[PDB]
Amino acid sequence: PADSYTLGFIGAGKMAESIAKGAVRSGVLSPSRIKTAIHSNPARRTAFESIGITVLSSNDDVVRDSNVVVFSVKPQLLKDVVLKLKPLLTKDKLLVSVAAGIKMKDLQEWAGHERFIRVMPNTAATVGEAASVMSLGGAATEEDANLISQLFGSIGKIWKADDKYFDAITGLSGSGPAYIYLAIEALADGGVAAGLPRDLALSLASQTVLGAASMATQSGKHPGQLKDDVTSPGGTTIAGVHELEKAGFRGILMNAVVAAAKRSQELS
Amino acid sequence: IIPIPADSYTLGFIGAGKMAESIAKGAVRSGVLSPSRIKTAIHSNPARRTAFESIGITVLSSNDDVVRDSNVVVFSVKPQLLKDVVLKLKPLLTKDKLLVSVAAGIKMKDLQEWAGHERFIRVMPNTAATVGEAASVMSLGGAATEEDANLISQLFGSIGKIWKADDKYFDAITGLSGSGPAYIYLAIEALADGGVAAGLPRDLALSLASQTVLGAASMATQSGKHPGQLKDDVTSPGGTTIAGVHELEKAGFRGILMNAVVAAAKRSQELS
Amino acid sequence: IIPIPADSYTLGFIGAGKMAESIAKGAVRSGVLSPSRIKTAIHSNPARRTAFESIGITVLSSNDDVVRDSNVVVFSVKPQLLKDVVLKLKPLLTKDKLLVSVAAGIKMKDLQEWAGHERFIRVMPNTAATVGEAASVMSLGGAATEEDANLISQLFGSIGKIWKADDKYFDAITGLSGSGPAYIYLAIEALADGGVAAGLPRDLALSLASQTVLGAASMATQSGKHPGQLKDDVTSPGGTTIAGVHELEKAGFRGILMNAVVAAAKRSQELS
Amino acid sequence: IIPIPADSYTLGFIGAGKMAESIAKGAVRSGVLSPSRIKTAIHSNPARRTAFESIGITVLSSNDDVVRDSNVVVFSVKPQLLKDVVLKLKPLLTKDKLLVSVAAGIKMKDLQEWAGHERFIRVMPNTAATVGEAASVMSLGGAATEEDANLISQLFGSIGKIWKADDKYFDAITGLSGSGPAYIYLAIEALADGGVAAGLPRDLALSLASQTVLGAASMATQSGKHPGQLKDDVTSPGGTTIAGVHELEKAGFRGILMNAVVAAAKRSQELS
Ligand SMILES: [Cl-]
Ligand SMILES: [Cl-]
Ligand SMILES: [Cl-]
Ligand SMILES: [Cl-]
């Protein structure tokens, strides 16, 4: 039903909006094939209506009218929401959760069936550059997985992974953007420290990060090869790299991923 | 100094390396100009010849002929070779031709002395020109006009973003946008290593690392927000992200990156 | 639970220490209360008696009489003494009287158990109550009404700013706003020492340090800007400010402050 | 050198930037000056024009006319531009006019040489002038009178606190009160980040951070106590505050701040 399927969003937050916008913009879905439900927030109703999507008055009606249901409510609220909708969550409907930290075992127990996909996107869904990972429930089919890959492909990239990896993933793709935000600010501060105007420094920092990551994503090269490509003999770049290595830069980043992943596990 | 005709100028590349090829490809692909308006010269490199010919560009046998036939000349030879190349061409570098250098570390004062005139623009692109995401900066010689600058904006816009700055900033720029990609390549590797340390398969860890960095930078470039606001947006109370961020801070992560920029900039100054 | 009369309620302080004095002075100075509407009890301390009497407040001879005559009772005895004080008063702590605790580290669950009812508000002020610049947070007991909260907001608004938070945040609040002033006192002394190290006279260095900190915090409070944006506003290219900031970052200054808040919060939990 | 009429002097701003605006607003708001006694000149810049006009101040078309019409002339152009601005105005800078520079890093010796006379006061305000909480210091040229100084005390008192110091201290003052606000902006962000690390919501953490810093500085400015005494006042035995302080001390927090001031001061001297 991939071509004509109806998608329903339970939870009308930013992630749902990003998905909806991405799918419409990429032609995966038309707005008439999407529904959401909102209560008592005007800004959010307007967000969906302004892209041509119908906002219904209840979660129940969104589920009834949807082949695929995406849950994006706050993780702490999800169990009760799925609970309440359970009679309507028939096995013919593919359920998807984007809730951070909620395992597949639990999603399946709450819904009462295993036709469930978990996707963990990250913050960059907003600009269509999410790093997402999906895990499949016990009854999710290969076709269900392709549908979801096509849907989340509209907001970034998507990879498959076993549910047991999702803590670590959270420490890397989930939390990693913050590490890069710090890097970007620090690079701009560095520019300014070196005598650059602040606006130029920040512009350059952000676009430098973007370009390097683009090289990494497109080049097919190991990052060490990419580093080798730009480190001319005795040049400026190696001088900067050397400072990084003196400080144990790589290990600091390893430490951040490990700590975030451990925190993820502790938070359950 | 006659204005360069914006819609019909011809472009000549002296130096037929990867940056030239990126600029030429980009400019043709983006419709800035058609291959028939572009010339390069290549001496006994049939591989580089094929690269230019295969996008519809005429390869001439001499630098001299490229310059004669061109309103705008882009010099992308290795920096160490640029002086002699400009001195040899000098009689042909008349003031009606806009000259551009992409050579790293060569200051405008020198370009102008070598050429004998001031109708010269300097651009410093970076390695991401290969994927059309360069961070470039341009500085204007004493006779380069606003219209010259715009012509160059539109040309280097094809390989990434381009900003203007005074030539005196170019050492610091070199340390930030020129060198910065290597800092990010390290960061990507380290993030991947970290993923693996936390139990992730390597291919997934590397895929996620690169795309996480790409996404965050895309947020920074598009959101209109300060990076501190972006960080605040993703750091939930007592959550995983703030745990990771705290580790960064404990270690002085920001100051490490500042140190790298400052060092690279200082090296740039040293190298002249 | 009868509403407390917003314009005419009487306020009683059990515990006549500095915080009580600051609240009383603040409320009188701001016109929230007149001194005739405030009572306290002081057993053998003519110094504290003088402090209250000198601002027009009646000092009674027993806690019991303060409670009987008061609609709102503020407990500000030392935290280790509070349980026994509340237990002794319990027969008088009828549900028509709003109880307030400013005791550090005593949770709402305990306050309510001791008093035998839930018409209780907990506040954690900080030391700057003495100059009307407290950072205070309040948490509501299970029977405290919105009107009770507003009454307390107004009262603690007389000595600084007051925010509302769930009692589960109070360890962390204790580590930040409760303990934070000491971190800033260190910072002020260190800034002054740094001024002197740079050649300034001591009185000027200390004056400048305090006022620099005051001014910056005032900018932070009033500007509506993120602190990163504020920092960007003052860091001129290659200038003195960024030189100083770079030193902070090399040393992991930010992480150190994060560590102090975390440690203090952890200690608060430990002492629970 | 005729005395500047204390109650009726006219004030002229050469440079219409943010600092000039803060001074003008402050002096008007505080009743030191009426807007009709203030002039500025804005050339080719309407946003600045609106800022001054919207507080009742006449914007003239030339620096020359501002100088002619003013008893006191405040120079607040970018430091790099000040020399040429003063040289151009020099014929109009008669010894009956009190000259004032707020330019960072420009020494009195230079101001006096450029103007050709010594009836000059230098002030170094800081960024908190925007909120009336500048830390400012003044130094007197060789012909500035005590009455000139008092006039400038009153004028800069309207945007914060103002002290007097010998010109030789100004590099250190620049590293402390000029640059210091950035150190505190970092501190505020870090304290907020720490609160989030400890489980606080971001908005509360930032609000608490800022107000904690404000309060502590207010305690320092008003209490008449040494910062060490203030620290002792809030460090209860084995309590949360001393646990946080201990973490700061383990990390050498005070030394880090000293380093920042020293580095900023050294940079100031370096920049001349
Ligand atoms: Cl290099
Ligand atoms: Cl998080
Ligand atoms: Cl500065
Ligand atoms: Cl304490």
**Separation CA C114–CA C89 (nearest Å):** 10
Specify whether A55 is located in the same domain as A178: no
**Separation CA D206–CA D192 (nearest Å):** 5
β pairing state of D11-14 and D38-41:
parallel
CA of B240 to the centre of ligand 2 (A): 4
Specify whether A48 is located in the same domain as A139: yes
Among D124, D141, D173, the domain boundary falls at: D173
Q: Which residue of B has its CA nearest to D196?
A: B237
Convert D148-167 to b/e letters by CB count within 10 Å (16 or more is b). Answer: bbebbbebbbbbbbbbebeb
Q: What is the DSSP string of chain A?
A: -TTT--EEEES-SHHHHHHHHHHHHTTSS-GGGEEEE--S-HHHHHHHHTTTPEEES-HHHHHHT-SEEEE-S-HHHHHHHHHHHGGG--TTSEEEE--TT--HHHHHHHHTSS-EEEEE--GGGGGT-EEEEEEE-TT--HHHHHHHHHHHHTSEEEEE--GGGHHHHIIIIITHHHHHHHHHHHHHHHHHHTT--HHHHHHHHHHHHHHHHHHHHHS---HHHHHHHH--TTSHHHHHHHHHHHTTHHHHHHHHHHHHHHHHHHH-
Residues of A in contact with B201 (CB under 8 A): 161, 165
B45 and B16 Cβ atoms separated by less than 8 Å: yes
Q: How many domains in chain A?
A: 2
**Separation CA D123–CA C25 (nearest Å):** 38
Q: What is the CA radius of gyration of chain C?
A: 21
Q: By residue range, what is the domain housing residue D129?
A: 1-173
Tokens linked to D236 = 């209860």
**Separation CA B198–CA B143 (nearest Å):** 58
Specify whether D87 is located in the same domain as D137: yes
Among C155, C173, C191, the domain boundary falls at: C173
What 3-state DSSP class applies to D116? coil
C4 is in an annotated binding site: no
Cross-chain residue pair D133–C240, CB shorter than 8 Å: no
Residue carrying structure tokens 């490990």: A258
Residue among D190, D196, D198 minimizing CB distance to B235: D196
Specify whether D72 is located in the same domain as D167: yes
Specify whether D119 is located in the same domain as D87: yes
Residue carrying structure tokens 């100059």: C131
Write the CA distances from C229 to A50, A194, A202, B267, D196, integer angstroms. Answer: 32, 19, 12, 29, 19
Q: What is the DSSP string of A219-263?
A: S---HHHHHHHH--TTSHHHHHHHHHHHTTHHHHHHHHHHHHHHH
- DSSP state for residue B164 in the 8-state scheme: E
What phi, psi does A226 have (nearest 5°)? -65, -40
**Nearest to residue B18, comparing CAs of B78, B105, B97, B66?**
B78
Specify whether D221 is located in the same domain as D147: no
Chain B within 8 Å of C259 (Cβ-Cβ)? yes
Say how many Å lie between the first and final Cα of chain D, rounded.
Answer: 30
**Nearest to residue C204, comparing CAs of D139, A154, D215, B30?**
D139
CA distance C237 to chain B (A): 10
Report the neighbours of A using a cutoff of 3 or more CB pairs below 8 angstroms. B, C
Specify whether A137 is located in the same domain as A246: no
What 3-state DSSP class applies to D192? helix
Specify whether A206 is located in the same domain as A142: no
Beta carbons within 8 Å of D54's beta carbon, 6+ residues apart? none
What 3-state DSSP class applies to D210? helix
Query: D80: buried, middle or exposed (CB in 10 Å: 19+, 13-18, 0-12)?
Result: exposed
Q: Do the two chains C and A touch, given a threshold of 8 Å on CB pairs and at least 3 pairs?
A: yes
**Separation CA D136–CA D180 (nearest Å):** 12
Write the CA distances from C125 to C143, C158, C248, D215, integer angstroms. Answer: 22, 12, 30, 11
D44 is in an annotated binding site: yes
**Nearest to residue B254, comparing CAs of C135, A253, C187?**
A253
| Ligand in nearest proximity to the CA of A242 | 1
Size of interface C-D (CB pairs under 8 A): 447
Q: Which residue of C has its CA nearest to D231?
A: C182
Q: What is the CA radius of gyration of chain D?
A: 21
Tokens linked to B180 = 């910065």
Residue D164 pairs in a beta bridge with: D138
**Separation CA C75–CA D225 (nearest Å):** 28
Sign of the alpha-carbon torsion through D169, D170, D175, D180: positive
Cross-chain residue pair D160–C189, CB shorter than 8 Å: no
**Nearest to residue C126, comparing CAs of C23, C54, C246?**
C23
Specify whether C83 is located in the same domain as C121: yes
Specify whether B57 is located in the same domain as B109: yes
CA distance B95 to chain A (A): 31
**Separation CA A195–CA D271 (nearest Å):** 12
**Separation CA A32–CA D264 (nearest Å):** 61
A251 and B247 Cβ atoms separated by less than 8 Å: no
Q: Report resolution (Å) to 1 decimal.
A: 1.7
| Ligand in nearest proximity to the CA of B239 | 2
A213 and B151 Cβ atoms separated by less than 8 Å: no
CA distance B43 to chain C (A): 44
C168 is in an annotated binding site: no
**Nearest to residue C222, comparing CAs of D111, D22, A254, B80?**
D22
Q: What stretches of chain B show up as alpha helix (H) in DSSP?
A: 18-29, 46-53, 63-69, 79-89, 108-115, 146-156, 170-173, 180-197, 202-222, 227-234, 240-250, 253-270
What 3-state DSSP class applies to C151? helix
Tokens linked to D62 = 């030339």
Residues of A in contact with C229 (CB under 8 A): none
**Separation CA B112–CA B74 (nearest Å):** 14
Cross-chain residue pair B250–C252, CB shorter than 8 Å: yes
Query: Residue type at C90?
Result: K
Dihedral Cα D145, D146, D147, D151, nearest 10 deg: 100
**Separation CA C192–CA C207 (nearest Å):** 8
- DSSP state for residue C118 in the 8-state scheme: S
**Separation CA D259–CA D245 (nearest Å):** 19
Among A169, A187, A210, the domain boundary falls at: A169
**Nearest to residue D241, comparing CAs of C80, C78, C176, C134?**
C176
**Nearest to residue A53, comparing CAs of A79, A81, A78, A25?**
A25
Chain A within 8 Å of C245 (Cβ-Cβ)? yes
Sheet of A116-120, strands arranged across: A54-56, A34-37, A7-10, A68-71, A94-97, A116-120, A130-136, A156-160
Query: Residue type at C40?
Result: T
**Nearest to residue A198, comparing CAs of B163, D105, B252?**
B163
Tokens linked to A1 = 């039903």
Cross-chain residue pair B179–A236, CB shorter than 8 Å: yes
β pairing state of C38-41 and C11-14:
parallel
Say how many Å lie between the first and final Cα of chain C, rounded.
Answer: 30
CA of B178 to the centre of ligand 1 (A): 7
Q: What is the DSSP string of C25-94?
A: HHHHHTTSS-GGGEEEE-SS-HHHHHHHHTTTPEEES-HHHHHHT-SEEEE-S-HHHHHHHHHHHGGG--
CA distance A122 to chain C (A): 23
Binding-site residues of B sit at: 14-19, 43-45, 63, 77-78, 104
**Separation CA A229–CA B182 (nearest Å):** 9
Chain B within 8 Å of C223 (Cβ-Cβ)? no
Specify whether D188 is located in the same domain as D129: no
Say how many Å lie between the first and final Cα of chain B, rounded.
Answer: 30
Tokens linked to D209 = 């951070």
**Separation CA A170–CA D167 (nearest Å):** 56
Q: Which of A173, A189, A242, A268 would best serve as a mutation to test chain B binding (most B beta carbons within 10 A)?
A: A173
CA of D184 to the centre of ligand 3 (A): 14
Q: What angle do CA D156, C236, B235 make, to 5 degrees?
A: 105
In what helix (H) or strand (E) does residue D265 lie, and over which residues does it extend? helix D253-271
- DSSP state for residue D15 in the 8-state scheme: S
Query: No. of H helices and E strands in chain C?
Result: 12, 8
D106 and D136 Cβ atoms separated by less than 8 Å: no
Tokens linked to D139 = 């130094």
Query: Residue type at B184?
Result: I
CATH number of the domain bearing residue B229: 1.10.3730.10
**Separation CA A101–CA A87 (nearest Å):** 24
**Separation CA C197–CA C190 (nearest Å):** 10
What 3-state DSSP class applies to C106? coil
| Ligand in nearest proximity to the CA of A229 | 1
Q: Which residue of C has its CA nearest to B250?
A: C255
Tokens linked to B79 = 């920096």
**Separation CA D10–CA D38 (nearest Å):** 6
A256 HSE (CA, 13 A, CB side): 35
Q: What angle do CA B211, B214, B215 make, to 5 degrees?
A: 85
Chain B within 8 Å of A229 (Cβ-Cβ)? yes
What phi, psi does C73 have (nearest 5°)? -120, 125
Q: Which residue of C has its CA nearest to B258?
A: C246
CATH number of the domain bearing residue A106: 3.40.50.720
**Nearest to residue B261, comparing CAs of D251, A255, A200?**
A200
Residue among B235, B245, B246 minimizing CB distance to D202: B235
**Nearest to residue D38, comparing CAs of D19, D12, D17?**
D12
- DSSP state for residue B139 in the 8-state scheme: E
Cross-chain residue pair A197–C237, CB shorter than 8 Å: yes
What 3-state DSSP class applies to C240? helix
Specify whether B169 is located in the same domain as B190: no
What 3-state DSSP class applies to B137? strand
D79 and D105 Cβ atoms separated by less than 8 Å: yes
